[model samples]
Target chain A: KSSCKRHPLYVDFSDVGWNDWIVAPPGYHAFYCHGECPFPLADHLNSTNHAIVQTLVNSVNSKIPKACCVPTELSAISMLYLDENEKVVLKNYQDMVVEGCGCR
Target chain B: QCKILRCNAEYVSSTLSLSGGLCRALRSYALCTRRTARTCRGDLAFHSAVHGIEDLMIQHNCSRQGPTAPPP
Candidate 1:
């Protein structure tokens, strides 16, 4: 369970950002790993009011033939980490929430 | 004429007219500019306050327990 590096993984969104003047234009590529952001980004995908990680996990888990979305005991072993171990410090959990859930 | 100074901290504070002290400040600004709350209420500060309050409310709610409490 302690196999994961005690660091966050970078989910680059430079390409997804697309426009310079768009929302979070410069703050692209949110971090997605444990000990990082508290909220999940998947929840924001549908509705800020309705989105929840458990909801997403439940949905993905309920699929007829699930693949790699549910959090299993083994899944617990797999945690994300920063690319090449870049030193980054986030201001708040919002940064991770904005990055979206990529552990799927 | 006070030219807008762009999106600095002052740019934000200068336009804060949505809530509390800022709301009153906006009223004063509107009076100085011969405008009204209808106009100042749409400034960046107003929008910021709107979003800030919305997020603030979210924390209290945080989807509220059960299966929607957001996984760590």
Candidate 2:
């Protein structure tokens, strides 16, 4: 007998750009998947991934605007895993910055 | 005895398949199962990270336990 089941899940990116950006709430953790692009233009998919990263960075910078003013000290991208209760369990607290240039 | 092995093998295969299935479900869930660029921006990124990691894990035959592994 197979002991696998699927359930409805919810994801919130509201605070994605904030300093508290995480995959989910404190009790919940980020989930991932595998497969080929289920879309037609999957080939040209690049900026979207960067956009999320940018949004997260923007959120952190917005939290501490002055601290992020310096260009040279920009850190690498960081990621955190939070639970359903909004508590951080795993975090990569690195100082990362993404410089926004007009050229894309 | 043979039945036990058959069951064990089937269970293992099913478990792996379930992990893969959950990953797909989560990606679809995050993307709202939508194909639009605007709606899928964040979802796409999230799924991309997820699938990327899954590829590595599966390649190494890594088995994970717990709900936090993949697919919520």
Candidate 3:
């Protein structure tokens, strides 16, 4: 028989790159740095946009499995960084922030 | 707007409870735009505070002792 009881520990969301955005639960922020912007060619002026989308995709792919989606109460800060190349340069930087409403 | 980087939630737990206290704490660290090394202090401060609390909890035996703790 274990004498030590499991205490309800407060999980520090900030450790894993999570932050609050607004003034409520799940009110965290997210921050990112894409490095130097690459000018897209005329035919692909939207390449930057496409790249941004891809970057987010990659970040989500890496973090979803870690239970990173725990709702507001159980979780705190959550963030992911993606580069222009559509790569997750920073999977869970401690300094990332969560902004605005809704998780994204 | 010039594309810098995109900050969004990769995953969020539905089980997590959102309280007014936490919301207030979050506001201090909210990210308005891409942050540089200089502007990243808020984020660092948040993490530091969280970790500080964690350390205190561990020290007070309020939670599981970290790996470095001496085995009883």
Off by over 4 Å in 3: A1-63, A67-104, B1-18, B31-72
- What TM-score number comes out for model 1? 0.17
Give candidate 2 misplaced runs (Cα > 4 Å): A1-104, B1-42, B66-72
Query: Estimated TM-score per prediction?
Result: 0.17, 0.18, 0.15
Identify the candidate with maximal DockQ: 2
For candidate 3, give the lDDT. Answer: 0.29
Which CAPRI quality tier does the interface of model 3 achieve? incorrect
Global CA lDDT computed for model 1: 0.31
Task: Give the TM-score of chain B in candidate 2.
Answer: 0.30
Ranking 1 against 2 by lDDT, winner: 2
Error of 3 at A6 (Å): 14
lDDT of 2 by residue, B4-65 (tens): 22222333344355646544433443233233444445444434434433443454454443
- lDDT by residue for model 1 over A7-76, one digit each (tens)? 3444444555533322232433333334221122221122222223333334335452212221112221
Candidate 1 per-residue C-alpha lDDT over B1-72 given as tens digits, one digit per residue, 9 for 90 to 100: 221212223323554333334443433333333332355453433333333323433434422122335678
The candidate with the higher TM-score, 1 or 3, is 1
- DockQ, 0 to 1 scale, candidate 3: 0.01
lDDT sort, best first: 2, 1, 3
